[PDB]
Amino acid sequence: MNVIAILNHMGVYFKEEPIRELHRALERLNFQIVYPNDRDDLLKLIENNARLCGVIFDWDKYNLELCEEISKMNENLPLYAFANTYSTLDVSLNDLRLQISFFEYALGAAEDIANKIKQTTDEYINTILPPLTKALFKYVREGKYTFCTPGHMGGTAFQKSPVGSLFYDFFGPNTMKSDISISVSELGSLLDHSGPHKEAEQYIARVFNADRSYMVTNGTSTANKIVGMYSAPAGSTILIDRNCHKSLTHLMMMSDVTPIYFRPTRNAYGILGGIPQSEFQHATIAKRVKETPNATWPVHAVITNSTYDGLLYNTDFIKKTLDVKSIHFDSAWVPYTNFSPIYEGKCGMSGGRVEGKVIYETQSTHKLLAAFSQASMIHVKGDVNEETFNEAYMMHTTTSPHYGIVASTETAAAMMKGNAGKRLINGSIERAIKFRKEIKRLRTESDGWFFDVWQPDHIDTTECWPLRSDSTWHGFKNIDNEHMYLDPIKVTLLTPGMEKDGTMSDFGIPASIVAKYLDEHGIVVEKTGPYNLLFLFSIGIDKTKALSLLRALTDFKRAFDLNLRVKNMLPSLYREDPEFYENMRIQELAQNIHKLIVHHNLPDLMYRAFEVLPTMVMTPYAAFQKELHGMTEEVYLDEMVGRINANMILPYPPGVPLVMPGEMITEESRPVLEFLQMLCEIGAHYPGFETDIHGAYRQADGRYTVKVLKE
Amino acid sequence: MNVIAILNHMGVYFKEEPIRELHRALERLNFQIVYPNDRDDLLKLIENNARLCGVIFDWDKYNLELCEEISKMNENLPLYAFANTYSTLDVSLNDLRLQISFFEYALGAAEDIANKIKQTTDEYINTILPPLTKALFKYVREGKYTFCTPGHMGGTAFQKSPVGSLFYDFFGPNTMKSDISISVSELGSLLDHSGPHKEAEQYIARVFNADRSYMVTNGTSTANKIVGMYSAPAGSTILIDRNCHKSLTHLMMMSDVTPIYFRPTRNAYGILGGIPQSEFQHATIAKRVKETPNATWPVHAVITNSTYDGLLYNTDFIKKTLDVKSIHFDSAWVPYTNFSPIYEGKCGMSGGRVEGKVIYETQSTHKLLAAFSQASMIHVKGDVNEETFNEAYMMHTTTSPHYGIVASTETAAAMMKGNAGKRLINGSIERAIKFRKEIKRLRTESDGWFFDVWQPDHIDTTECWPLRSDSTWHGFKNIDNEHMYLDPIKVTLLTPGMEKDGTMSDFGIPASIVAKYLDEHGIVVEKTGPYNLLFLFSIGIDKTKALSLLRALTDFKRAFDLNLRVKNMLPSLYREDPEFYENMRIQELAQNIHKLIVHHNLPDLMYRAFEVLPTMVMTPYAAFQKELHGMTEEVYLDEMVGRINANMILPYPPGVPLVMPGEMITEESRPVLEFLQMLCEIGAHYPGFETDIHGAYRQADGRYTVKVLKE
């Protein structure tokens, strides 16, 4: 932050001479001097260059063309405008947040002007930063408190060991000095909720529109277990979603509760939809209570909004139909549904406090924002006990938190405040919609097959495309209108190979081959398998990272139409088995895999398997108790009908659980077992595409083994 | 790491000319050149300067005086010794780990020598570093895999926001690039325990002498709950220590178990001793099972070794008398009991595998070592199930671990391996023993009172001082011999004010006033209150931080003997209440507080209160169930006899729990209630020394309120 802009050359000498004298004075305090050209030149030095804090221009030249466009980007940006004798303001310059510092054209006084710019720049730094981060940066340059934790104390022990000097010189001197615990008086403690930590929690909830919010320092996987243990006593009933996370499954194994799984919607490509509106009724929930042994009235509900693919729900209908006093929303993929008018009424924070209910959200911080890993939040909207919810937060958070992540956790809430942060959320949406139009433009004009974006036929708008009932792009039968939304920054590329009715075709390329082709250039697909390609277009994807993805997609069509070899296209796959992948081309491998999907019938053995649910004998908490006593055994995959599993089956593809720990496969869940045996055959012929199931151990013959319980 | 040493000036020209030519060649690749004088000069450039990797000296001048002292410090340190024509080795140079690189004195070949030094230096970096850290540093300069988590992607989003540029320019560009998740193929995942993470768990367990060790990324407070949820089913019996931690209390409130509290020893100064040998008997444990309703055979035991003050126990006697198959040792203060011969047989890892038992330890990493915060380990010594214990670890660690802390967790185990790490553990002990002798030297020679170290009269040794039965320095009656140890790096300053029998005196200064006086110069007291001052002498405490503590202690005697004012000595205390602390001196405040301790009788109302235990009605897990249902109420402190509390009482001073959540104060625990009412009176007369109890809330009249359960 040391860029000073000097716009507009008057041509006279009594105005350019003070500029030349100031040029030699600002460089003595480390400041970069730039000279833009016209009005459009200064506008490009703010959106692209974020390290600018000084704009020098003539006030009697552009008093209305610069005070309006700059105010729409940054409000507290200092403006070192130079006025004259006959200078005045304008009536249209009253409702604009600006910081204009006037000066004169006096010779010899250039030294006093340089001291005022440095003092004004320090005021801008001490304003846009939160008080928690301000106390961290001040303690590095001035704090000298000895005998504190940790033992390194800014890297003192690293300067005495030969191996410790390499780890300290990589990050930097200012990196280890900010690693302090609760051994500081002028910073308070995180568990005490006092001092700078008290004002930090009120600053995040005010920007994100909330009443009280904490700072989880162990990722979202930990924040879901703290809230789940607040409104679920031993022996109650919870309403967890079927499309849950690995951490959400362990929550059912740590508390003696009786969960009730929902019935989400799904298509044939593998993209899971959402929970229908009929499941939130009173006659639907109460019907499953009597059918499930040992189950009372549900007091907590876990809703995955959005899912792993990115599909927003309708919170305006759940907060009125679902009769749960503690409704939870797993907002681990949408930490931005507030800073844009196309996201109002789509989350729990949008709106107001529900009478007699409370909304919990675990907005991830390190997922789709800009902060260190292992960072999460707990958004509470309602009237809860402060002395009770505080004890549950200390059950998973240590007494010495890492302030390096805490400073970045609150930073994400400050980077989005104001018009400077709205240009990053709306900017990523405009870059995502532009990428969606570049696919349809290069599809009809191309000569052959081309990738397709899972989007409606009409994308001539900047909002969330609703999933209506008279469309064929989504392919969700019996879908509810005004309930399923689409995330514009969640572009899902649909590779050719299937039709629009859900059947198979004759010519197509699976998404597993494209996933490895993008890895050679440094692109890893977020979700691949059947015929989908999920990508993340958050604030970290600029115009360079977005255009680099389109160029790699055009190279795959050129290499496939010319029929190239595997060695001259996929060097990483050739090193796995050079003998088998010798005389093989890109067209021979793409056609042999497509025939195996039609032969084994993948879309049918996957849709019917995920629809039915195995018979849940006991609660997931009771299954973990038998494992600690040693009553577990390893059986074959073909010999397991009528047994209780011990772990959760997570087959890849897709990425959703199959059998929960504590269920039994009877005659109702017959297609469930057929889905596991089909992946063991298709993933054994060609190397590289082996079967990936988190729970199936590979032996020395080919047959996988599962972990069940003793009879 | 770029320091090259050139020792011994022969005086000739055919040997000094290649040195001058090499001086201009090594500077082109960023290397600092130093020229030591005699033999003692080179020895000071290694212990103090850890960034050295090149030693150039004549082989035919000091072939035995340098190859022996350097080998005792660093083994893999390269030695760029220059040999001659008539050069040979020595018989005494066979059992020494060195790396000697021979060269010649050729003109013009100085460029080829610089390439060999840079290549040898790169081999030294790629050897002393663990494979997990090596893969993290290499991924920064080569790995460019985009479209992955976290969202910042090396700090890309920070370059677009004005406030984000100030946070990216603080830690450094190489800091954000090293923040990656499990979205990397060549680094594996932490939950999968494969790849670099698989070899990292074996490298730590080998140095720390263990079979399997993990890396907890949420501090030690979280790792204690992982072991507690493995050998303690719902309805069993655990043996938790009375001197537990805040996280250990929440473990009893999350699992339906029946804990049995021990009876640790204690004196009058507030320093808690340890568990006697009689509590580990079979007739003592089985007697408390019948007296406690709903209690079976104990299957798990939690032993706090060491405590908060630093007192090692006797693991050689516990592992034979205590009949518990799952014995836990809370080693949250001794992460170094395997690098010195004066610590053998004092921890659970020392020795061998116990037949039919298993030892669990939670060594703290960010306490007395050198690593980032929120880092812990789980040491397992026994025969446990791998597929069962792994599920308990994933119930508290997120799926995307922060590799910045994981790389530093294994670094702490790598910085101590070899003789280079033994000089830091034994070096901190030598600096601690030297500090203990400087107190007794400045006590008799001084003219007046002086601080005293809680140590025996004979400290003329370098080992752990045992607590015998014929000594008066410890003041623990009915103590067991060869069971209580002393940590030399845990110096506890005993301020004058009490006698050696446990009564009170006439002249003394409390430790609370000294605690605030040390904060002015930059010294934070770890534990204070009655008449004790606990400090931490880790590896980070060098000779500068050690000598700075003695100077501040001598300044307190000078300011007190001359009778100075509070405003001219304690500026922080004067700003709290300038009106009351106006006409007050340092002698008037030190004498008024000492009379309040004798009047209210603190040592008697604290020793008898901690001895007796309240009547535990229900288990701590059952007390948390009534809090979620809204059956709590706030009552006065004077009206609570016969009620069940909801929170844990943690009064300061000292720092140990008083009443556990789920206990009742009857007629047996009468002194327990008197201890809470005594602190409310002594901490209300003079500002700054208010009553600090983690459980009692301050109202608007003076009387504190507690949180109990409804009848």
Place this chain on the structure above:
Amino acid sequence: MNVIAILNHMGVYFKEEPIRELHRALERLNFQIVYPNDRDDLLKLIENNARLCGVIFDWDKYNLELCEEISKMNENLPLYAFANTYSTLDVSLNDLRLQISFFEYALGAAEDIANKIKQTTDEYINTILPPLTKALFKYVREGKYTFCTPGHMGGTAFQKSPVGSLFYDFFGPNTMKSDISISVSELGSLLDHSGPHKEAEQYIARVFNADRSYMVTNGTSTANKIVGMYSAPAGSTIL
């Protein structure tokens, strides 16, 4: 105030090399470096030279010949003494007012040492000066309050008149900026006897051994008329 003294030479290289690295780091923040000779050389750099604030010497060489003579001349004078491994204090160093800052001989950390000396020097300035004078110097560097008396406002009107530029350039920029009236909130007023002016009256009386003392701004000739008009009514008798 920017003179740093480095006394004695141990002759070794692991102690003189950190001195050479610190020599190039202290000059970047405007600090003069002097190299005294023997013990009598450092004593002449304190009584004669008053702009000195840093004394660097070996702790294991003159631990009693320097900590006694310097204490007899200045109490809050910082002492940047470098200690070693086998270093300790003396029993005759308990009743002496000194400010000893310990360091090491580590290479590469010369930049961090320069930041500790600059902050220690700033703490020395903010301690020996009274709070009234300290608040006046900070108001000049940090103070953009407009529409206040007097009319010059740090010398603003002097930059417009040709004759006024000769009077403003004679004293200095920091001279006219320190001439402020009671138009400042964080400095209080002299007639109100509150804020910094309240603590200044109690500080002067404590130095000159008194209970209360004011500050007359019109010489002694005016102070004699204030006391005379307090204990001499109309028609009384004075001696």
